[PDB]
């Protein structure tokens, strides 16, 4: 943009010297002074002054010498009109740039202000209120404000799968149940993973809580802990997975899809969660793989000792009108 200003200013400087030559040098005060005068007649002076005159006139900041003739009045009026359009275009271009650079922060500050209004409106306790404020500072400092799903939603499924393979396929193949999974199924699973971020001291899952997800630790350290949070049985580092058996719908489980350990985050951890429903959707097209996944989960549940249950227990939720339908259907 500055180069365009310089070319226009330089061009206007040359037109002023050409007009002064046409009218005559030194005939009046507006035109360039006499060339024959050695004080004014050399190339360094006449270009630099005309450059100064063109800048002084186009920018409309300083005061130009007043014109004398009606032809001279028209040229200065034209420069002022041109300089108005140039200056308004400069401010519009720079002003639109400043809006673009600030747009990320401006829309982030609106989210904090919207949340801050809600906590004072609903009388959220100060312990939880400071937890939310500390969370938003982590997002801005480490530049995690934008959601991953919104970033890649425009990409095609082939390119999205290619990105997701390079992030999760190394860790997902370390899972015991997905040991012998087909290459097509593994691409389906890594597309189903959803990012999750936990603050320090957050509980991923508690003992006795219903579990329908499997988590893989992209970054951060998680600790298996007792009922008292401080005491820790084991440590889960990046690349570890837990909850793999929760997503498998084993026919008989003593677990009953309830968590058997307390998992807590020592610091900020990035987790990717594969849900029970997402696994079911992925294996619709891979029926043989679904059988192998359930058999492997059944074998693991035998080793724990938590497999055999519901031999004679079954749950029936078919409606009286829907059960009537099979009787009508069987007759036809």
């Amino acid at each position: 943009l500055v180069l365009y200003i310089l070319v226009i200013i330089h061009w206007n400087a040359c037109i002023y010297y050409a007009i002064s030559k046409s009218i005559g040098f030194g005939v009046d005060t507006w035109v360039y002074p006499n060339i024959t005068d050695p004080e004014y007649g050399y190339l360094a002076r006449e270009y630099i002054y005309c450059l100064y005159w063109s800048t002084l006139t186009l920018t409309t900041i300083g005061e130009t010498p007043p014109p004398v003739k009606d032809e001279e009045y028209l040229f200065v009026i034209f420069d002022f009109l041109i300089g108005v359009l140039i200056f308004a275009t400069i401010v519009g271009n720079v002003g639109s740039m400043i809006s673009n650079m600030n747009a990320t922060r401006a829309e982030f500050q609106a989210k904090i202000d919207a949340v801050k209004h809600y906590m004072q409106f609903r009388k959220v306790s100060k312990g939880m209120e400071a937890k939310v404020i500390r969370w938003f500072d982590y997002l801005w400092t480490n530049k995690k404000t934008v959601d991953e799903r919104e970033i890649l939603k425009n990409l095609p499924a082939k390119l999205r799968a290619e990105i997701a393979i390079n992030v999760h396929l190394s860790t997902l193949k370390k899972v015991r149940i997905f040991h012998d999974c087909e290459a097509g199924l593994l691409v389906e699973l890594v597309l189903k993973l959803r990012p999750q971020v936990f603050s320090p001291g957050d509980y991923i899952c508690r003992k006795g809580d219903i579990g329908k997800e499997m988590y893989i630790i992209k970054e951060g350290k998680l600790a298996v802990v007792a009922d008292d949070g401080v005491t820790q049985y084991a440590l889960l580092s990046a690349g570890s997975c837990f909850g793999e058996i929760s997503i498998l719908n084993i026919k008989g489980s003593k677990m009953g899809n309830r968590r058997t350990a307390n998992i807590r985050s020592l610091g900020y951890s990035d987790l990717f969660c594969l849900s029970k429903d997402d696994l079911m959707e992925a294996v619709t097209e891979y029926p043989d793989a679904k059988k192998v996944l359930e058999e492997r989960g059944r074998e693991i549940l035998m080793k724990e000792g938590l497999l055999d249950e519901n031999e004679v227990a079954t749950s029936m939720e078919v409606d009286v009108q829907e059960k009537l339908g099979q009787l009508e259907t069987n007759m036809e």
Binding site: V2, I5, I48, Y49, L51, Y52, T55, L56, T59, I61, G62, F87, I90, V91, N93, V94, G95, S96, M97, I98, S99, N102, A106
Partner: peptide, 25 residues
């Protein structure tokens, strides 16, 4: 003094547009 003024006028124009753009934002 001519060359100083040309630079100052250009800075005054680009600096002024920065003031309008920041306040308009």
């Amino acid at each position: 003094e001519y060359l100083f003024m040309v630079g100052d006028f250009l800075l005054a124009v680009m600096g002024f547009a920065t003031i309008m753009g920041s306040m308009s934002s």
